[PDB]
Amino acid sequence: LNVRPSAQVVWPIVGQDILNGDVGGGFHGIQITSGLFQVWRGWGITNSFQLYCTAIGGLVLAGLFLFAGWFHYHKRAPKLEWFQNVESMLNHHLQVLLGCGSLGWAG
């Protein structure tokens, strides 16, 4: 209720450190309005270590996504037949992406 969410600290240069305002919790930074703190509280994250793990996990997933894109273009590119399975895609995207994602998240 009292502390103001802030996750961007400015470097002290050409007087721009003024932007690091008193946001509460003995911390100086730009107050964030993206609602990330309310998201992470909803996720049940209670420490900085859990965020570090999640951040690293993300960088590994971003790496995997880069590889996938290189792999699925340069190395193993699906034929037009594959792409035009709209019934299979809808089945997998409704059941796994949305359905199992929502079941997983309910978990």
- The residue ranges that bind ligand BCR (CB under 6 A) are 54, 57-58, 61, 100, 103-104, 107
Which of 33/79 has CB closer to ligand CLA?
Answer: 33
Token reading at 38? 């309310």
6, β-bridge pairs: 31
Rule CB under 6 A: which residues touch ligand CLA? Answer: 34-36, 38-39, 43-45, 50, 53-54, 57, 97, 101, 103-107
Q: How far is the CB of 38 from another protein (least distance, A)?
A: 30
Per CB under 8 A, 86 contacts another protein: no
The most distant pair of C-alpha atoms in the chain lies apart, rounded to whole Å, by 60
Is residue 22 near another protein by the rule CB under 8 A? Answer: no
The CA-atom distances, in angstroms, between 35 and each of 31, 41, 75 are 11, 10, 40
Based on the shown chain and the rule CB under 8 A, indicate whether residue 104 belongs to the binding site for another protein.
no
Minimum separation from the CB atom of position 69 to ligand BCR (A): 17
Rank residues 3 and 53 by Cβ distance to ligand BCR and give the closer one: 53
Q: Integer distance in angstroms from the first to the last C-alpha of the chain?
A: 29
**Residue 9: helix, strand or coil by DSSP?**
coil
Token output for 9: 């600290």
